[PDB]
């Protein structure tokens, strides 16, 4: 892999703690605190008593037939092969008490969804660092494993105090994606316009979701529909009409006065409605905004702890 | 009648069962086993609260063999709903999890009793707003019991004196006009009749609709647009032609074409005889 030395240290160190973990059992965990919830599960910070390790544990209660469920658990075991500094560390997945447990590493920063609340808006200097991570994260999944995320959104981008940014809960289990398809309506959607009318069109459709997420985190507001005229100098739609807005209305954009042109351009290429015209990972990697935000030396770790309330 | 309110210390809340579109169910004791659904609107407004007490007045005046009994509510620890406790599994568990195998004689009978109870609700002018196999239980593997009906005012949390239904529930049973949430009151008898037709697709195919669409929002958009429809080719070979045609009438995209339950129930009993 194309990584440095502070990453090859952290990567190999994880594989060590991962070995001190054998069979994962529901009784081997003591509940500490909850970390977050979503329509279709809840996550807890837990401690693995057979090795003191502290982990996050996503519990997915699915009313699914056992033949399908055993396929899901079988398909989730691919997560042992994903070992990148932009993919959340993974410890194991098992089934007990009618619930699927996905045991992953703990990220004390949380999701960029919660970080956006404590911050209000996120500086473009920081979103540049985030964009680099998501672009490399989707790349690692597309190249080393030919699997695509299908759920890039602020709640699936995780951060921590060591200044890391990692993707999670990508579509490794196709059966899990289809079981979740019988969920209740949400309130918002990061689905690209082609996925609403048809199916995934390679890694381009994940890029739209990253673009729409950048716009929300840049302006502190879900951008469908775009902000009002004087709501914007201050610097509820039905779920169906949001989807209808995505499919038939011009894509959202950033305001012209507050963000750099490279950034406004970077999210504009990310939000082109035609998935073929839309930018791909090869282009976004060498975009002006990424070229610049890769060169800058922003203190992301210090910015995060300040934004939450953690010590230096 | 009036005060249908159960006090505190009367309901032995037991095990957590599960959560749904607007509550979380626990198996409680209350002169026998009951089902206590803790509503998601734990902090209600006295304008919402009085509409709830008004709708409980109608639900409490319902008595049908195919309807789950509504035993009132509570406002002690938090707003909750007390209903009959059901043994056995729901229809969703039988059809899609346990994969229980019925004959067509039994499948039509389940569909007959469901129209039986639904016709009672529309006879008393009650919109279910949530008809689905998850809200249909098989009592001792015999009688059909419809639950989670009505209760419009505890779905879509209020602002102060408004109940715009921020659409909720499961999308697979929602009529297209319900999906769009566009004109005044999308929930109607025909919105229920469509949801009923989806339950027929379940019984007659063993599958949920749109088995090849694994995208939640893609279904919401395409259905509300009139692009996506339940693929009726998936119906079992031994399904009566009269049944597959009744099924197709309830799934009409424009709601005014769907039949009403007096006509539906008549068609089902007719094809039950000519079987
Ligand atoms: N490894 C982790 N470390 C810390 N927090 C986590 C971790 N994984 C998940 N979370 C938190 O758990 C919350 C809920 O998880 P999740 O199941 O992904 O719901 P969601 O992604 O927010 N929405 P949805 O996926 O549509 O149900 C997230 O918003 C995160 O803040
Ligand atoms: N009266 C009941 N008796 C026993 N179990 C019940 C009863 N009502 C619901 N349940 C179960 O409780 C769990 C949650 O039910 P519920 O909150 O009603 O969600 P849902 O039925 O799946 N969708 P919805 O009814 O529209 O909210 C499920 O496992 C149901 O089978
Ligand atoms: Mg997630
Ligand atoms: Mg129910």
Task: Describe the crossing of helices B261-273 and B241-250 by its angle, rounded to 10 degrees.
Answer: 170
CA A206 to centroid of chain Cα atoms: 11
Tokens 């597959």 sit on residue: B244
C-alpha to C-alpha distance for B93 and B87, rounded to whole angstroms: 13
Token pair of B95, please? 């059809």
Contact (CB, 8 A) for A96 and A26: yes
For residue B180, which of A187, A236, A244 has the smallest C-alpha distance?
A244
Compute the half-sphere exposure of residue B10: CA atoms within 13 Å on the CB side of its CA.
Answer: 15
Neighbours of ion ligand 4 (CB under 5 A): B 135, 148
Beta partners for residue B221, in sequence order:
none
C-alpha to C-alpha distance for A70 and A65, rounded to whole angstroms: 9
Number of domains forming the structure of chain A: 2
Token pair of A53, please? 């390790």
Please state whether B109 falls in left (phi above 0), alpha (psi between -120 and 50) or beta: alpha
C-alpha to C-alpha distance for B171 and B117, rounded to whole angstroms: 22
Contact (CB, 8 A) for A133 and A297: no
**Whether residue A28 has a cis bond before it, omega within 30° of 0:** no
Mutate to test the interface with B, among A185, A187, A193, A206 (most CBs of B within 10 A): A185
DSSP state of A87: B
Q: What is the set of active-site residues of B?
A: 130
Token pair of B77, please? 């620890």
Rounded to a whole number, what is the distance in Å from the CA of B246 to chain A's nearest CA? 25
Sign of CA dihedral A279, A285, A288, A292: positive
Beta partners for residue B84, in sequence order:
B34
Whether residue A211 is found in the same domain as residue A233:
yes
Please give the helix or strand (H or E) that residue B33 lies within, else none.
Answer: strand B33-39
Sign of CA dihedral B62, B68, B71, B74: negative
C-alpha to C-alpha distance for A139 and A151, rounded to whole angstroms: 15
Characterize A161-175 residue by residue with b for buried, 16 or more Cβ atoms within 10 angstroms of its Cβ, and e for exposed. Answer: bebbbbbbbbbbbeb
β B5-6/B12-19 pair status? unpaired
Method: X-ray
Mapped onto helix, strand or coil, the DSSP state of residue A291 is: helix
Q: What resolution in angstroms, rounded to 1 decimal?
A: 3.1
Question: Which residues 60-79 of A have a C-beta within 8 angstroms of B?
Answer: 61, 63-65
Locate all alpha helices (DSSP H) within B70-165, ordered by sequence: 91-96, 104-123
For residue A185, which of A36, A39, A62, A61 has the smallest C-alpha distance?
A39
Whether residue A50 is found in the same domain as residue A116:
no
- State the binding site of B for ATP: 17-25, 37
Sign of CA dihedral A111, A115, A121, A125: negative
Token pair of A233, please? 């100098």
Q: A106 CB less than 6 Å from ligand 1?
A: yes
Whether residue A251 is found in the same domain as residue A125:
yes
C-alpha to C-alpha distance for A63 and B25, rounded to whole angstroms: 15
What are the structural domains of chain B? 5-84 (3.30.200.20), 91-273 (1.10.510.10)
For residue B154, which of B77, B85, B224, B78 has the smallest C-alpha distance?
B78
Whether residue A132 is found in the same domain as residue A262:
yes
For residue B199, which of B169, B233, B174, B225 has the smallest C-alpha distance?
B174
* Ligand 1: nearest atom to the Cα of A37: 14
| Nearest protein Cα to ligand 2, atom 20 | B20
Q: B240 CB less than 6 Å from ligand 2?
A: no
Residue where a domain stops, chosen among A63, A78, A108 = A108
C-alpha to C-alpha distance for A235 and B30, rounded to whole angstroms: 55
Rg, Å, chain A Cα set: 19
CA B117 to centroid of chain Cα atoms: 11
Number of H helices, E strands in chain A: 13, 8
C-alpha to C-alpha distance for B216 and B213, rounded to whole angstroms: 8
Whether residue A294 is found in the same domain as residue A159:
yes
Beta partners for residue A280, in sequence order:
none
With CA atoms as reference, the chain B residue closest to A188 would be B217
Range of the domain at A140: 109-312
Whether residue A280 is found in the same domain as residue A226:
yes
Count of other CB atoms within 10 angstroms of residue A86: 22
Mapped onto helix, strand or coil, the DSSP state of residue B262 is: helix
């Amino acid at each position: 892999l194309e990584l440095d030395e502070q990453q090859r240290k952290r990567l190999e160190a994880f594989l060590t703690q991962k070995q001190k973990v054998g069979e994962l059992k529901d009784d081997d965990f003591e509940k500490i605190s909850e970390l977050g919830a979503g329509n279709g599960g809840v996550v807890f910070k837990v401690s693995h008593k057979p090795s003191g390790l502290v982990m996050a544990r996503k519990l997915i209660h699915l009313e699914i037939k056992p033949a399908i469920r055993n396929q899901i658990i079988r398909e989730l075991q691919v997560l042992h092969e994903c070992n990148s500094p932009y993919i959340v560390g993974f410890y194991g997945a098992f089934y007990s008490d009618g619930e699927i447990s996905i045991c992953m590493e703990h990220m004390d920063g949380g999701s960029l969804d919660q970080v956006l609340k404590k911050a209000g808006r996120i500086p473009e200097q920081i979103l540049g660092k985030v964009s680099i991570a998501v672009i490399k994260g989707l790349t690692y999944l597309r190249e080393k494993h030919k699997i695509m995320h299908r759920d890039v959104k602020p709640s699936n981008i995780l951060v921590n105090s060591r200044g890391e940014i990692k993707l999670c809960d990508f579509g490794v289990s196709g059966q899990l994606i289809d079981a979740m398809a019988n969920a209740f309506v949400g309130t918002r959607s990061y689905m690209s316009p082609e996925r609403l009318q048809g199916t995934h069109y390679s890694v381009q459709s994940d890029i739209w979701s990253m673009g729409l997420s950048l716009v929300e985190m840049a302006v502190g507001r879900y951008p469908i529909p775009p902000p009002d005229a004087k709501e914007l100098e201050l610097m509820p739609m039905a779920i169906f009409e949001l989807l209808d807005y995505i499919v038939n209305e011009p894509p959202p954009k950033l305001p012209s006065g507050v963000f750099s042109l490279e950034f406004q351009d970077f999210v504009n290429k990310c939000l082109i409605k035609n998935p073929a015209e839309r930018a791909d990972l090869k282009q976004l990697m060498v975009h002006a905004f990424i070229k610049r935000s890769d060169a800058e030396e922003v203190d992301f770790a210090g910015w995060l702890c300040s934004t939450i309330g953690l010590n230096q | 009648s009036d005060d249908w309110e159960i006090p505190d210390g009367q309901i032995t809340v037991g095990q957590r069962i599960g959560s749904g579109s607007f509550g979380t169910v626990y198996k409680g004791k209350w002169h026998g086993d009951v089902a206590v659904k803790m509503l998601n609107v734990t902090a209600p407004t006295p304008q919402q609260l009085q509409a709830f007490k008004n709708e409980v007045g109608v639900l409490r005046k319902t008595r049908h063999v195919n309807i789950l009994l509504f035993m009132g509510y509570s406002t002690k620890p938090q707003l909750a709903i007390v209903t009959q406790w059901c043994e056995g599994s729901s229809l969703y568990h039988h059809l899609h999890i346990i994969e229980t195998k019925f004959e067509m004689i039994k499948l039509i009978d389940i569909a007959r009793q469901t129209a039986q109870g639904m016709d009672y609700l529309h006879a008393k002018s009650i919109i279910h707003r949530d008809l689905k196999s998850n809200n249909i239980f098989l009592h001792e593997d015999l009688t059909v019991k419809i639950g989670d009906f009505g209760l419009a005012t505890v779905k879509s949390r209020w602002s102060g004196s408004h109940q715009f239904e921020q659409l909720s529930g499961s999308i697979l049973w929602m009529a297209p006009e319900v999906i769009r949430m566009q004109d005044k009151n999308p929930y109607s008898f025909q919105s229920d009749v469509y949801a009923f037709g989806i339950v027929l697709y379940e019984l007659m195919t063993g599958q949920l609709p749109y088995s090849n669409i694994n995208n939640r929002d893609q279904i919401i958009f395409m259905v509300g647009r009139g692009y996506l429809s339940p693929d009726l080719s998936k119906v079992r070979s031994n399904c009566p032609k009269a049944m597959k045609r009744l099924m197709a009438e309830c799934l009409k995209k424009k709601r005014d074409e769907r039949p009403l339950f007096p006509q539906i129930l008549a068609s089902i009993e007719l094809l039950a005889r000519s079987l």
